[PDB]
Ligand binder design. Structure first.
Ligand SMILES: [Cl-]
Ligand SMILES: [Cl-]
Ligand SMILES: [Cl-]
Ligand SMILES: [Cl-]
Ligand SMILES: [Cl-]
Ligand SMILES: [Cl-]
Lengths: 330, 330
């Protein structure tokens, strides 16, 4: 099996001919620039690279890359800047002056975020470069969360051989109550659909179907009710159930004994952790002790997708995250 | 490798000739009775089986077991009952009458617990039989936690091939603050020593050494300080450190990057989870996705050890848990 290639093949079938454009603000980053050349040579994702044109071209030359067919935009000299300034001023509802917007939009991450907001591109991948802060920051200001969603959350694809799961929230929210967990469950189901999965979402705990009693157990039980309510409202093509211990969620024989007649019978493929402590630890255990590759974090909940690279990313990481982001944009 | 046999070999070297006696209250349980015969045929653990003598002998016959060399005690007719009644009345400080004690001590779990308290046996393993409640309940009343320990906690040996880790608290305490986590860390270190390990205890979080800020991160940071204080006080032969994400605790290269100069460098063998949600989920992930066997739960913190079997245990589980309990008694 080749789990990463198999995930990409599902995303490619969705993306083929859709012409999705992903902004890569960090054109002076070697990994990003090289990944842009690779994406350009597919049909699925069109990279829009930002930076100083002379510096980016010099870096390409150093790297022995032909970037002549890549769209490369320097914010300060772009014919689009004027419209993006005006839109950013309108979006900010008077919180930013025209002069401030003219200044801010010279920043590659702000400019890139505005390309997405203005419909000139579909999503954005950044974070490889030290000068990029949190990729998500301008996105929160400009793009915002989707109607009905309070906050972003972070998911990972956990992949090994022929197995592919989604785990979340593993990165973002350190304090979660029932409403927050239910939000994560619904967003994760939607993300799983974007990625071509048939979502079966287990809300995890140390209890299975009332086997323990505590405030944290009640929290997850109430989250299941709210998530099911939100899903059914929207006729989401997903099953959401809980509370389950991890084995009851993923082992049919355990489910049969501990959760008889539940909607899930040990066949979950999306796992919602009851806290960030649990999720961060749990994906790291699956990664190291299970030998699963952890692809992410992938952000969900925004009106348009943006995702954040590690400073230590590889070229392949940029390529893969660009595909994931492009799939999210559909 | 044979991870379970290898753990038993360490425990056998400690137990050889020490004549440790483990009470098995459930002599009318097939698994327990068969395990008693197996333990009797070693030198390490002496089983003290309780029950109605005629019923236990009839069950042995049905099972084709020779139990003639096993110590078998019927509480109601035991020559020891009178002394155990008097001791139980004294231990209860007037909360139980002599008549009530005479009645209660006919119960195999109470009688067995009193054998331990009175120094007639060293530990106790129960829980296979439906009529046994929580094995620990009489223990809490009679044996109690060790001086300086508030509560029991539950650990698992996570074993695969040549790898052996301790995870806790994975079973008992649904609400833990810094003091409670520090208690678990110190008890787990002590348990690891009992089991022949050189304990390197990582206190887990979603943060590594200040990489995130939240109340839950502060909780674990403060727990590390308190645990180190308690360990150093007692010149415990253990290292306790944190806070660590799971990969920083167990992967040297991650530790070097994320926790430079920390006391642990990716070489933890004892893992203290920041909550029961995290621990219960985390061991189940290690078990199912990692293919680790999870041996437990093993209780720690009592003045004398008692441990609890699943109703669905095997014969081997009773045998193994008897060895673990006997090791704890040293
Ligand atoms: Cl559902
Ligand atoms: Cl669990
Ligand atoms: Cl990355
Ligand atoms: Cl230490
Ligand atoms: Cl972690
Ligand atoms: Cl068991």
């Amino acid at each position: 099996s080749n789990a990463m290639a198999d995930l990409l093949n599902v995303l490619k079938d969705k993306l083929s001919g859709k012409n999705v454009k992903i902004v890569l603000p960090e054109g002076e980053d070697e990994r990003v620039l090289t990944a842009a050349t690779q994406l350009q040579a597919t049909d699925y994702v069109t990279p829009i690279v930002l930076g100083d044109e002379t510096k980016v071209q010099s870096l390409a030359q150093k790297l022995n890359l032909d970037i002549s067919n890549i769209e490369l935009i320097n914010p300060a000299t772009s014919e689009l800047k004027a419209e993006l300034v005006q839109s950013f001023v309108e979006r900010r509802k008077g919180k930013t002056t025209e002069e401030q917007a003219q200044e801010l939009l010279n920043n590659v991450n702000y400019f890139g975020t505005m390309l997405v907001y203005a419909g000139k591109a579909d999503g954005l991948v950044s974070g490889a470069a030290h000068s990029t802060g949190d990729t998500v920051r301008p996105a929160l200001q400009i793009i915002k969360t989707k109607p009905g969603v309070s906050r972003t959350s972070g998911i990972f694809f956990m992949i090994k051989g022929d197995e592919q799961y989604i785990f979340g929230d593993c990165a973002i929210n350190p304090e979660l109550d029932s409403q927050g967990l239910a939000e994560i469950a619904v967003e994760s189901a939607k993300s799983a659909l974007s990625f071509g999965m048939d979502p079966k979402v287990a809300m995890l705990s140390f209890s299975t179907k009332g086997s323990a009693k505590s405030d944290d157990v009640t929290k997850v039980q109430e989250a299941v009710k709210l998530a099911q309510q939100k899903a059914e409202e929207e006729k989401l093509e997903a099953i959401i159930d809980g509370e389950f211990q991890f084995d009851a969620a993923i082992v049919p024989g355990v489910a049969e004994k501990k959760a008889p007649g539940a909607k899930l019978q040990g066949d979950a493929n999306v796992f919602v952790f009851p806290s960030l402590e649990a999720g961060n630890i749990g994906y790291k255990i699956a990664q190291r002790l299970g030998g699963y590759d952890a692809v992410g974090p992938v952000l969900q909940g925004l009106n348009s997708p943006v995702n954040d690279l590690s400073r230590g990313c590889s070229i392949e990481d940029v390529y893969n995250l660009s595909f994931i982001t492009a799939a999210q944009a559909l």
